[PDB]
Amino acid sequence: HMERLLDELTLEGVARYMQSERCRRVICLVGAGISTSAGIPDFRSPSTGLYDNLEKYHLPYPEAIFEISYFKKHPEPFFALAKELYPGQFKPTICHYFMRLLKDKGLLLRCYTQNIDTLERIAGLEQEDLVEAHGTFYTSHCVSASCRHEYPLSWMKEKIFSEVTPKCEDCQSLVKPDIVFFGESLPARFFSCMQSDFLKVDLLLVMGTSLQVQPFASLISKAPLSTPRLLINKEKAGQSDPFLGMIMGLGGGMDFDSKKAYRDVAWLGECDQGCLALAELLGWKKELEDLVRREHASIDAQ
Numbered sequence: 001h002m003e004r005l006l007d008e009l010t011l012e013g014v015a016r017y018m019q020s021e022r023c024r025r026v027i028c029l030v031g032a033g034i035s036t037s038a039g040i041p042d043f044r045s046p047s048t049g050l051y052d053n054l055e056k057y058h059l060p061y062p063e064a065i066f067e068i069s070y071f072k073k074h075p076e077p078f079f080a081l082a083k084e085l086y087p088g089q090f091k092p093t094i095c096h097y098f099m100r101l102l103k104d105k106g107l108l109l110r111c112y113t114q115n116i117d118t119l120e121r122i123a124g125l126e127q128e129d130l131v132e133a134h135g136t137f138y139t140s141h142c143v144s145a146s147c148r149h150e151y152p153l154s155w156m157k158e159k160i161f162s163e164v165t166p167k168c169e170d171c172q173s174l175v176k177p178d179i180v181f182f183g184e185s186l187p188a189r190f191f192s193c194m195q196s197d198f199l200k201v202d203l204l205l206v207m208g209t210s211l212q213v214q215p216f217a218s219l220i221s222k223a224p225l226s227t228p229r230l231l232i233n234k235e236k237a238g239q240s241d242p243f244l245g246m247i248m249g250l251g252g253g254m255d256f257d258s259k260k261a262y263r264d265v266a267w268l269g270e271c272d273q274g275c276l277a278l279a280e281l282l283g284w285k286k287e288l289e290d291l292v293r294r295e296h297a298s299i300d301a302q
């Protein structure tokens with residue numbers, strides 16, 4: 001039915017495709033891997049990832065600290081962890097500024113991020129460019145569906161940095177930031193943007209994510225079957241034979257390596273280096289390095 005769009009399954013092939021008139025709209029799908037070079041830990045890297053460093057909270061399992069039913073029984077661990085990450089001021093990475101450059105080149109249809117560090121915004125992506133798929137800590141809400149009283153960040157800090165579990169002033173239920181926990185619905189914007197974006201995406205750029213949580217993992221299968229998909233990641237993600245307990249639905253994954261591979265490319269390494277390499281192939285490398293240099297300087301000056 002649809003023609004094949006990559007002339008070869010390499011970064012060079014993706015680069016030639018991006019410079020063609022057929023690549024008009026790029027969607028970026030990113031996770032915590034795009035911020036580790038800034039100093040923010042990811043979740044699932046062995047030894048260094050967050051989930052291997054929560055022994056002190058004596059959880060039944062690491063994910064419980066971000067699960068809504070456990071949170072409602074034992075909310076203290078999450079708030080203790082939240083103040084462990086608060087003090088750091090972080091700069092966006094080369095990878096963040098590559099997405100910013102896609103925006104300035106008119107190619108960025110949308111960035112879907114699982115991160116809450118807001119570094120996409122700090123890099124210059126605007127609200128309409130972004131789907132913060134796993135929420136934000138900027139706003140908070142009571143957890144009672146009958147209440148849902150909204151509280152600002154200043155209110156949340158006042159409770160946290162004063163050693164009190166935030167409780168709603170109307171119903172005394174727990175109040176948490178609008179970070180999406182396991183068991184919680186995603187923002188409505190996620191679905192309204194998804195329904196429209198993935199009908200008109202020419203390239204999926206998947207960076208710094210293990211694709212281990214739904215529904216975000218489903219997004220790679222929402223693109224048209226002809227749409228090339230480039231992974232820039234330390235490890236292959238989304239490619240595996242089926243097995244009991246797999247996260248992806250049947251046939252919902254990447255195919256980099258089988259005899260039937262036709263559109264998926266894995267560039268294995270650091271996200272910063274992968275974006276530099278891709279920029280170089282596109283003739284954008286000095287432009288990208290200038291952007292990072294000038295934007296990091298402007299951040300420091302302010």
Ligand SMILES: Nc1ncnc2c1ncn2[C@@H]1O[C@H](COP(=O)(O)OP(=O)(O)OC[C@H]2O[C@H](O)[C@H](O)[C@@H]2O)[C@@H](O)[C@H]1O
Binds near residue numbers: 049115270271
């Ligand atoms: N500098 C790097 N360069 C390239 N890849 C990297 C780098 N650092 C890490 N990686 C890779 O980046 C990937 C990190 O995958 P995960 O740690 O699962 O982060 P997520 O965003 O997918 O977790 C999503 C949700 O799961 C949680 O429950 C939360 O709800 C999250 O929102 C790995 O494949 C690393 O090899």
Ligand SMILES: OCCCc1nc(-c2ccc(Cl)cc2)no1
Binds near residue numbers: 081085116134182
């Ligand atoms: O389901 C999405 C959860 C996103 C989330 N990540 C964090 C976090 C807190 C502290 C540290 Cl060190 C690292 C990460 N909080 O919420």
Ligand SMILES: [Zn+2]
Binds near residue numbers: 169
């Ligand atoms: Zn309430």
